Symmetry: C2
Subunit: 536 residues, 2 copies
């Protein structure tokens, strides 16, 4: 019963437009130094004439506060195979969902809608440990009369200084064809490069320390304009020339951004390890396949090609000092019937690039058990099986699994999602990999989508909402999403555990048994974080 | 707390996706003979895996039952200037809205989502009076087991038999450029015709009894493909031949469809009565304006045109026995200052077609008081004034008025809407005119729209959500809508009051004071219909 309502919320609960107004005029936060922390300024107009509302900070200049508006996106259905307890927004969804973050400080307030601003504060290392407080001012208008509300935010800055994450690597398969579709660019033109740079930058600032390189276009579908950063020419039948300029430019750029580790494209097409990679040549203005679409991975054409490419890849890797900081891929999620196919490829690799060390999504243990993949990446559903065999490994999730498992879906509750870094830490993963940073377009088709109105690349329910991307295409690069922010705060919690000497076996992490059985309460997150930042 | 919930609801409350499951296993309806009645079969899945559900009727053959699926549309905001006490779906909106009706009997059931089928029953005049019961059968699948549920429906059909509506006329300005834009047809091609016929049949089956003729294209905006049903040639400068073949074909089709009365496009452009209508001729393949688009309404150019068209119009009207069954429009929605210009034009009309009686949408009472229009159409907001004066008049709305006033918007509760016919009856309206039956495209621009994702012609809040269309474009014709059905049943209530001889002054209608103050309860509708159908 008030014309306008503002309150402050933790960055860990969602604010759906229907949700009733809160009061909450103060907010208490905990932060390590050399970190960034986040919160929500929520508002609900009780008037029926539309108005304007603008969100500013005062007294937080040294915190470098970045203010964004939480935009909404349609969500038609809940995802499949998620019990209601495990689903965010019961009673508010299906419906509108907060996800994209827009760079606006003043928006329109609409009648009886609840919306939020998302503030990120950069807690610098050179900050006195203690409580630092500032104000957020909300300015709106009732009729012609201007009004404001001042809200109070205090941050308990800890003595703890976060040190760069180490011995843990995160990679996403950012997509260059996705940029070329959503922005209508020629692949690798200057706008393409500008957007790619903005993406890799967004990644490394969110915890992604591995720069993926799509040297070969990664999809079974044949494109007219594929993302293949390796320039490949064929001056005679079967003689290949390789031009590394794009990959070189990429690697130089990524190193200038902060990347030290790099990941490469597969060498055999997915599901079965039975087909060669599609490799294209520029014919006038088109890109045509160098060979057939059905060309076998054991065919003399592909073997000849590899006997030329792999040594040249080696030359490049050494010349540029990439060889030790490069993960290489063979073929993904090989099923338990083309093991020998994989093994054939592996042995061909051994005979043609013995130096090469292989990393592959592999969820059946009787693959790592036999060191088929040098660095196996099970899906978290198989993490426990790899952990009884004591095979060191990475983890990945995509779409599956769901329900009680970890994911970062639209309907994954944010506290459950913030648990990611803790689970990576306590369960001693070597790294995390995800296919869906910015899969903005139509699954398996050279056709653009619309992330702002389709969250599953047109493949629900098989593809879950929010799985193909965590960023939204914006005019100059990615727009961060609430999920991306919470995930990066989660990786930052991994960094906290690291830089506070907390051991995976510490009893305060004890309830984190598997990637399915672990505390989802924001209360757990808050109190654990307290202990860690207070004793430090 | 069962895997699958099915219940029965009236046609008068919406069913939102978050809406909690109900139990109501039977449902009493009441109808009069020769009527159409409606109800809803709702289901919420309580399973995490997708399933299929099919709706069927059993034992309702004589009622020619129609089974349709209630589709959902986005609703970004609430409409402005509507207090909570007047909004439908509080705490479920903004979000997904039930509105489009789809010709499917079997769909996917999605997790934790409340959806419903819409069933229209045809109660025939011959039918014996009394209580007629039939059943609904819901067939879904749980895992691998086939599940089904019988629901009971009792119709209490009265002795009263509905006589066709007398002395009250409904017209909607359906748009043929709307057809041209959404279906990407060339104007007046055979597909355009088949779709127009579909729309006209729809309108008359929903109690719209006036066929609108867009003889001139109504918009102030210059289209390259205008909808100008009159063909106009200019063999010498300023001599105009007219070809009526398309208006002939339209009138033939409408009369074959049951249409008796007809309405015509305006003669001066809207707001100020100052500019000439845009009239076009063909130039090879393009359409050209005949004159400047700044052309003055009192210019010599335009008057010389009217001196030729009006007698020619009169010939056409005589040749087809239209003259007495045709409404004519001068210039839409002129403001209070503009009466001057209207007077000027009106007298021009009198001196060049003295036979012509014009109706127009005129909110200021000085239009009616001074007989500037032969049939005034005040906005319902202004109705009471014309009633205080006992000036006969039509009523209309559009976008506004809002709040407690009657309207037909997305968030207008359905009981409020069903009161439409009752207020028409008790308040002695001559007729009802609405501008937006199928305005499917961008407000004032020659660009398609998407009525499935946009509901205000891209003009929220200016245009309110739900104003520009009550029908959706399906592949062979219109798709009905919940609001459309309820509104047709409102006109059907006008027919009920008329057929049982309930005088406007009957006490049961005493609560209906203005178009802003009147009972909005579904109990009121139900109990009053009870009274009328038991006296009979």
């Amino acid at each position: 019963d008030a014309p306008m309502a503002v309150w402050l919320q933790s960055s860990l609960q969602r604010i759906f437009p229907q949700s009733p107004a809160q009061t909450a005029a103060a907010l208490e936060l905990q932060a390590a130094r050399n970190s960034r922390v986040s919160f929500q300024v929520a508002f609900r107009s009780n008037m029926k004439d539309q108005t304007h509302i603008s969100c500013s900070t005062e007294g937080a200049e040294t915190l470098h506060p970045r203010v964004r508006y939480v935009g909404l996106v349609p969500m038609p259905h809940f995802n499949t195979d998620v019990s209601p307890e495990e689903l965010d927004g019961v009673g508010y969804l299906p419906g509108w969902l907060p996800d994209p973050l827009y760079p606006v400080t003043k928006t329109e307030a609409h009648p009886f809608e609840s919306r939020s601003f998302w503030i990120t504060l950069q807690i610098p290392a050179s900050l006195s440990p203690g409580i630092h407080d500032f104000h957020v001012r909300m300015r709106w208008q009732e009729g012609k009369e201007e009004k404001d509300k001042l809200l109070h935010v205090k941050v308990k800055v800890s003595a703890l200084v976060l040190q760069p994450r180490s011995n843990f690597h995160v990679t996403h398969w950012w997509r260059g064809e996705a940029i070329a579709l959503q922005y209508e660019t020629k692949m690798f033109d200057e706008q393409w490069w500008k957007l790619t740079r903005a993406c890799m930058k967004n990644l490394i600032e969110h915890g992604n320390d591995v720069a993926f390189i799509q040297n070969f276009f990664e999809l079974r579908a044949v494109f007219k304009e594929p993302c293949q950063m390796l320039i490949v020419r064929e001056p005679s039948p079967g003689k290949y020339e390789f031009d590394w300029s794009r990959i070189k430019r990429f690697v130089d750029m990524c190193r200038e951004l902060g990347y030290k580790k790099f990941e490469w494209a597969h060498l055999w097409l997915y599901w079965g390890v039975q087909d060669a990679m599609h490799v294209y040549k520029k014919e006038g203005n088109a890109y045509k396949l160098l060979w057939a679409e059905n060309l076998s991975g054991t065919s003399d054409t592909y073997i000849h090609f590899l006997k030329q490419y792999l040594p040249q890849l080696h030359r490049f890797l050494l010349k540029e000092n990439l060889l030790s900081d490069s993960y290489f891929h063979l073929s993904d999620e090989p099923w338990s019937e083309h093991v020998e196919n994989y093994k054939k490829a592996r042995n061909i690799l051994r005979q043609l690039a013995p130096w090469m060390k292989v990393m592959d999504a592999l969820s059946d243990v009787r693959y790592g058990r036999e060191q088929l993949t040098d660095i196996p990446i099970p899906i978290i559903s198989s993490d426990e099986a790899y952990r009884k065999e004591q095979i060191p490994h990475w983890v990945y999730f995509c779409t599956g699994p769901r329900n009680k498992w970890l994911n970062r879906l639209y309907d994954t509750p944010l506290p459950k999602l913030r648990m990611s870094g803790w689970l990576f830490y306590k369960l001693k993963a070597l790294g995390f990999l995800h296919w869906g940073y910015n899969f903005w377009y139509t699954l398996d088709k050279e056709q653009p989508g619309d992330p702002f109105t389709e969250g599953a690349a047109y493949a629900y329910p098989g593809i879950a909402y929010g799985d193909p991307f965590v960023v939204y295409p914006g005019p100059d690069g990615p727009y961060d999403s609430i999920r991306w922010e919470v995930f990066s705060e989660s990786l930052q919690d991994y960094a906290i555990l690291q830089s506070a000497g907390i051991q995976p076996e510490d009893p305060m992490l004890a309830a984190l048994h598997t990637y399915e059985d672990f505390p989802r309460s924001e209360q757990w997150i808050n109190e654990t974080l307290k202990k860690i930042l207070e004793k430090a």
